[PDB]
Amino acid sequence: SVIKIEKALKLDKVIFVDVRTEGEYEEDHILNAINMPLFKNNEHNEVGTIYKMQGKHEAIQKGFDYVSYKLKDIYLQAAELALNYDNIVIYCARGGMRSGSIVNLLSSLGVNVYQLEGGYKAYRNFVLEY
């Protein structure tokens, strides 16, 4: 269910899906990744602030407010990728709840997906490894 970047980059017929905002994906993303953003740029900032000021419980609620309607499309996009790629690796900034929730849900619906351990940060550290 979780995979390390060193192994993910070696998978046959692999596609990386970045669930960060369009803002973050545009700045830098994993080579050949597609963007399936969970949050719009503004939604992301509000969820982050809520998390800081109120905690996780309230941040999750706000997340549902912004993503519950997007979830069928996420399934449909993943189901389509699955016709074309043998391996689907989902990643967020640091490998927490954004990618974890999507991966767990998709997997319970029978779509074979993995979460990238450590998110985009793990990829950056892999590329820049001395």
Write out the catalytic residue numbers. Answer: 92
The amino acid that residue 72 corresponds to is K
Cα–Cα distances in Å, from 54 out to 51, 59, 99? 6, 7, 22
CA of residue 8 relative to chain centroid, distance: 14
Q: Are 47 and 130 in contact (CB under 8 A)?
A: no
